[PDB]
């Protein structure tokens, strides 16, 4: 096994188009029917080529601009990195509907002539993974997850496992979503609000948001050798499932073991469901834990696969230095509707 560290982060959100601007507004909100918030003053021609953009969807666009910031933050010389030792992990649930919607409708009224050659490449969730591999030339093991809600959380976790076992020295893990297109827009505005979980219960009131968030995970010795500014160390990952309410409580007690009996810790919670506070506290009380609870979900909104990652990029920013101060470990949790229980652990140096 080997140790994994966060060297760089980057994200875009309706709050802000960079990591610093998002973190500032998060502090401000923390100090003092559903809708889909879009990005303010965003222009993808500012980042991506015109020949390429006309081929790809907005979710692929948001991912490309996210990694550019993350790579720039890490101060990696891309020409000096071995492409064989760099991989790409992605989380994405909804795909790229905006690019193919009109062609899907057109195929019924017109015929084959209504459809173009980029429907297959633009829509599928692993498109971001491939576009990133063409642009940067990264050749190591690169996966895409599309598990409901948790996709991006798994992307980070299994990217760390890959670095640990010596598959790659660097990993671009993160998530991206686009929820503005008519089909997914009208779906989320109606259906998603009223839905409930069998395991976790009823959903809290809240909006949805789109964008992306990415980290630059890498091997510890690789970071120290090149004289990189390490934000934090990825100390642990949890990936479990709860088929019923009996297992739910026992599953949360494994998230408790991720603390290592650390009193000086902050717990960022999922914040989708009402009953989370009660069930998590009851499980954490059994394991003798004393920690602070923070909910970023009302401020950052439900971003599905990104919701887990956007916490990690912010968590990484605080550890590199309101409530996050005097804390040497930030644990994040993420649930799903079907009953996933997942959590990451970042610790300071």
């Amino acid at each position: 096994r080997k140790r994994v560290v966060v060297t760089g982060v980057g994200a875009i959100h309706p709050d802000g188009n960079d990591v610093t601007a998002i973190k500032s507004k998060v502090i401000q909100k923390l100090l003092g029917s559903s809708i889909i918030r879009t990005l303010s003053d965003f222009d993808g021609a500012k980042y991506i080529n015109n020949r390429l953009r006309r081929k790809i969807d907005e979710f692929s666009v948001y991912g490309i601009v996210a990694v550019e910031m993350a790579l720039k933050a890490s101060r990696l010389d891309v020409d000096k990195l071995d492409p064989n030792r760099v991989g790409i992990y992605v989380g994405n649930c909804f795909g790229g509907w905006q690019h193919i919607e009109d062609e899907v409708k057109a195929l019924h009224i017109e015929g084959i002539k209504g459809m173009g050659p980029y429907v297959a490449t633009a829509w599928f969730p692993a498109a971001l993974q491939g576009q990133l591999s063409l642009l940067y030339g990264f050749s190591a093991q690169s996966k895409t997850f599309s598990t409901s809600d948790v996709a991006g959380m798994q992307a980070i976790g299994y990217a760390a496992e890959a670095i640990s076992n010596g598959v790659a020295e660097v990993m671009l893990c993160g998530a991206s979503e686009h929820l503005s297109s008519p089909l997914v827009k009208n779906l989320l505005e109606k259906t998603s609000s009223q839905k409930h979980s069998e395991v976790f219960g009823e959903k809290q009131p809240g909006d949805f948001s789109e964008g992306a968030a990415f980290l630059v995970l890498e091997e510890r010795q690789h970071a120290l050798e090149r004289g990189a500014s390490i934000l934090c160390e990825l100390t642990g990952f949890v990936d479990y499932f709860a088929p019923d309410k009996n297992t739910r409580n026992n599953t949360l007690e494994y998230t408790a073991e991720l603390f290592n009996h650390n009193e000086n810790a902050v717990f960022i919670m999922d914040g989708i469901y009402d009953d989370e506070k009660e069930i998590t506290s009851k499980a954490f009380s059994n394991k003798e834990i004393k920690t602070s609870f923070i909910n970023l979900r009302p401020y950052l909104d439900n971003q599905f696969s990104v919701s887990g990652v956007i916490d990690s990029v912010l968590a990484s920013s605080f550890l590199s230095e309101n409530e996050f101060s005097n804390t040497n470990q930030i644990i994040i949790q993420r649930f799903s509707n079907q009953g996933h229980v997942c959590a990451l652990s970042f610790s300071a140096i």
């Binding site: 080529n49 020949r51 006309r54 002539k113 173009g116 050659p117 490449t121």
Partner: protein
């Protein structure tokens, strides 16, 4: 006309209209692939209002080749 086609390929391949030569080979000069050729063939069907088979657009090696096709 060729002016109509020259504008399309200029925007599709992200080339300057003045710089883009019509007799230049699309694959060799501008790194064009079969996927872009199919997308280009769709735009010809859209704008000019004709039918283009896969066998037909496969022989579009040059900018002038598609001009010769669309004329007939």
């Amino acid at each position: 006309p060729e002016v109509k086609i020259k504008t399309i390929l200029s925007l599709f391949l992200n080339i300057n209209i003045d710089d883009f030569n019509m007799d230049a080979n699309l694959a060799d000069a501008y790194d064009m692939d079969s996927t872009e050729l199919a997308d280009l063939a769709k735009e010809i069907e859209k704008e000019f209002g004709i039918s283009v088979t896969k066998s037909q657009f496969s022989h579009w090696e040059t900018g002038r080749a598609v001009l010769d096709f669309v004329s007939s």
